[PDB]
Amino acid sequence: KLPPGWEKAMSRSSGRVYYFNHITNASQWERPSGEPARVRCSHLLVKHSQSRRPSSWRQEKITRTKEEALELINGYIQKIKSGEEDFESLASQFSDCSSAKARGDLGAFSRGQMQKPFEDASFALRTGEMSGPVFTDSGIHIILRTE
């Protein structure tokens, strides 16, 4: 009953049941449905003033608050989910990581290499699926599992 991390919840707005993943922060109306050694993922990182290194190729001094970074992240998720913009396009333009130059692709990795909240979300995604906001010391990410 429900894959790893998935649980059922009541929408306050609509009164309909939804499904949420406490490991990936994914949420959706639809019922979701041998852990691989490696996964491949892309990400979009929004840094803020409390990030470990508040600097990127986009902006030498990042000054936004963590609250403002999360609003940005939420906005990007809305644009991706609506199909107004695709993930790769937003990562290329707006990610505060040099991975932006490869459409956010980080390549393949196993457990024990990445920041643990990043890793955990990555391995709880099925191929094709996207996370909600994932919080690490680097900042807030959206993760897309591509393999």
Swiss-Prot record:
Outcome of swapping K47A: Loss of peptidyl-prolyl cis/trans isomerase activity. No effect on the interaction with IRAK3/IRAK-M. Abolishes IL33-mediated increase of IRAK3/IRAK-M protein levels
Signal peptide (UniProt feature, chain positions): none
Tissue expression notes: Expressed in immune cells in the lung (at protein level). The phosphorylated form at Ser-55 is expressed in normal breast tissue cells but not in breast cancer cells.
GO MF terms, alphabetically ordered: beta-catenin binding; cis-trans isomerase activity; cytoskeletal motor activity; GTPase activating protein binding; mitogen-activated protein kinase kinase binding; peptidyl-prolyl cis-trans isomerase activity; phosphoprotein binding; phosphoserine residue binding
Annotated effect of mutating C97A: Loss of peptidyl-prolyl cis/trans isomerase activity; decrease in DNA repair of double-strand breaks by homologous recombination slightly less efficient than that observed with wild-type protein. No effect on RBBP8/CtIP
PTM description: Phosphorylation at Ser-55 by DAPK1 results in inhibition of its catalytic activity, nuclear localization, and its ability to induce centrosome amplification, chromosome instability and cell transformation. Ser-55 is dephosphorylated upon IL33-stimulation of dendritic cells.
CDD domains documented for this protein: WW
EC number: 5.2.1.8
Catalytic reaction(s) noted: [protein]-peptidylproline (omega=180) = [protein]-peptidylproline (omega=0)
Subunit structure: Interacts with STIL. Interacts with KIF20B. Interacts with NEK6. Interacts (via WW domain) with PRKX. Interacts with BTK. Interacts (via PpiC domain) with DAPK1. Interacts with the phosphorylated form of RAF1. Interacts (via WW domain) with ATCAY; upon NGF stimulation. Interacts with PML (isoform PML-4). Interacts with BCL6. Interacts with FBXW7, disrupting FBXW7 dimerization and promoting FBXW7 autoubiquitination and degradation. Directly interacts with RBBP8/CtIP; this interaction depends upon RBBP8 phosphorylation.
Domain remarks: The WW domain is required for the interaction with STIL and KIF20B.
Protein name stated in the entry: Peptidyl-prolyl cis-trans isomerase NIMA-interacting 1
Organism placement in taxonomy: Eukaryota, Metazoa, Chordata, Craniata, Vertebrata
